[PDB]
């Protein structure tokens, strides 16, 4: 009985979905159910990126699995430099301003080696050259130490084919490529597994094979990176139970519920809905829309993507905004709001945490309106727990939203909120006159009036802040555990 959360990889900076997959793993750990993260892409850094969040036992990477490197950890470091000098009698030439070396057999140039670290304990790649200095092969090293993939080059350093090795050096997978729109596209895959050879045309067919090899009767799969995982499960049998998790809005236009096409990333799942046992969304509002859109052809269930768990409310009057600096969030309006408010409340300040394209434009409107000591673009911040202790109110002025971990955390710190009434997320975390207020989309005047009203009524802000503590508590770890356990119990018995 194993529960597989299938995303794609883990980066250095975790995306929303990667965060959601890890958080679901942690809950399943506590609850006591077997869970692992399944990753699909080839990433010879995955073990480093993962180390700060999960254990080697906690995930199976597809390429690690067929390279017999699942659960493996770091080798003892290996002095490549002395191997090449003392054992091989090669001549090494450090490149300045880098962690690189050219490697020579006397006058002959052999190899170009990139080390990751400046202590040269993490060999990253090594390029090989023929007698005409043509670069013929690239050797790509896993951070754990072994040579993970060799890549054969043609023409202008174009990728022709790749070989993937277990740590002892045996070839376990082959891949062949042809270029399309300037980029290599897979045209074949060979896999050496079970003392046999297996053949495929693309990486969706290999994933489907991967999935089948993990499946024992009783297992449960979760499609979390549906642009990739949904085409894969669509090529595996219906006897293998799988739940589609959506992690954003399901349609290109939220304003045409009945008719808007589904988002591109969810098309293949929605076109083969009977493959999946259920869909999981993060809000009750989105559960209701998807249920109606699919005509209840399968269960839809809302389970939040995050949970709630320092001094708070230590109250100048601090407004806050935790939002990427992007068009959707319409952060200028928050500047406009402050423009009007400072004349009535001049001890006011508005801290906007996040980053993005729209920073320059936002800095300008600050200068234009003389608010430089009232509106601060504070950038991205690794933890905001100190920033929340003295926040009077938070503001959301976006035109489209999703369930916000940030909003959930801010409500755990007693910070009430005023938000436009847009989908999705606001309505999930914000009961009007309980922990904040919901405003009609783009009503900058009702926004002003409601923001003004709470400032002029601290005792209201107390109620709202107490309501935010009450709101947060409904998203407890144990609340999420209970939903998840129930959902898994119910899904598996219907699939009996």
């Amino acid at each position: 009985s194993m529960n597989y959360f299938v995303g794609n990889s883990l980066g250095v900076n975790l995306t929303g979905i990667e965060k959601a997959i890890i958080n679901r793993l942690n809950l399943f750990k506590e609850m006591g159910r077997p869970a692992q993260c399944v990753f699909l892409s080839w990433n010879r850094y995955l073990y480093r990126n993962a180390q700060n969040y999960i254990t080697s036992s906690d995930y199976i990477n597809m390429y690690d699995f067929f390279q017999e490197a699942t659960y493996l950890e770091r080798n003892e470091p290996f002095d490549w430099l002395s191997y090449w000098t003392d054992e091989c009698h090669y001549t090494l030439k450090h490149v300045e301003n880098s962690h690189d070396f050219r490697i020579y057999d006397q006058e002959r140039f052999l190899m170009y080696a990139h080390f990751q670290d400046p202590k040269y304990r993490i060999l990253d790649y090594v390029n090989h050259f023929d007698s005409q200095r043509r670069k013929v092969k690239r050797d790509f090293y896993d951070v754990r130490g072994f040579l993970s993939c060799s890549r054969i080059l043609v023409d202008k350093q174009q990728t022709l084919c790749e070989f993937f090795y277990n740590p002892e050096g045996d070839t376990k997978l082959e891949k062949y490529f042809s270029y399309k729109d300037g980029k290599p596209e897979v045209q074949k895959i060979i896999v050496y597994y079970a003392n046999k050879q297996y053949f495929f045309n693309n990486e969706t067919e290999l994933g489907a094979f991967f999935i089948k090899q993990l499946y024992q009767h009783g297992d449960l799969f979760f499609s979390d990176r549906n642009v990739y995982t949904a085409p894969i499960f669509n090529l595996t049998p219906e006897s293998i139970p799988v739940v589609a998790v959506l992690h954003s809005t399901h349609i290109k236009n939220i304003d045409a519920l009945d008719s808007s096409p589904f988002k591109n990333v969810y098309k293949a799942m929605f076109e083969n809905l009977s493959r999946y046992r259920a869909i999981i969304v993060s809000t009750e509002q989105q559960k209701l829309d998807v249920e109606k859109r699919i005509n209840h052809t399968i269960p839809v269930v809302n389970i939040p993507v995050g949970y709630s768990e320092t001094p708070v409310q230590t109250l100048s009057v601090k407004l806050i905004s935790v939002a990427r600096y992007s068009p959707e969030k319409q952060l200028h309006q928050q500047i406009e709001l402050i423009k009007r408010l400072v004349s009535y409340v001049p001890k006011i300040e508005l801290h906007m945490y996040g980053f993005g394209s729209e920073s320059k434009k936002l800095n300008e409107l600050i200068q234009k309106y003389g608010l430089e000591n009232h509106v601060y673009l504070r950038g991205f911040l690794s933890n905001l727990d100190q920033e929340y202790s003295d926040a009077y109110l938070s503001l959301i002025t976006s035109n489209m939203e999703g369930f916000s971990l940030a909003l959930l955390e801010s409500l755990a710190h007693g910070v009430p909120v005023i938000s436009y009434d847009i989908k999705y997320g606001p309505n999930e975390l914000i009961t009007s006159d309980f922990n904040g207020y919901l405003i009609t989309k783009n009503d900058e005047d009702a926004l002003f009036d409601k923001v003004k009203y709470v400032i002029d009524h601290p005792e209201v802000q107390q109620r709202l802040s107490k309501g935010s503590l009450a709101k947060a508590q409904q998203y407890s770890k144990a609340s999420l555990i209970k939903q998840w356990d129930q959902f898994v119990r119910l899904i598996l018995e219907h699939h009996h």
């Binding site: 690189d100 050219r102 170009y112 690239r138």
Partner: peptide, 4 residues
Amino acid sequence: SDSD
């Protein structure tokens, strides 16, 4: 040209 020798690095990537």
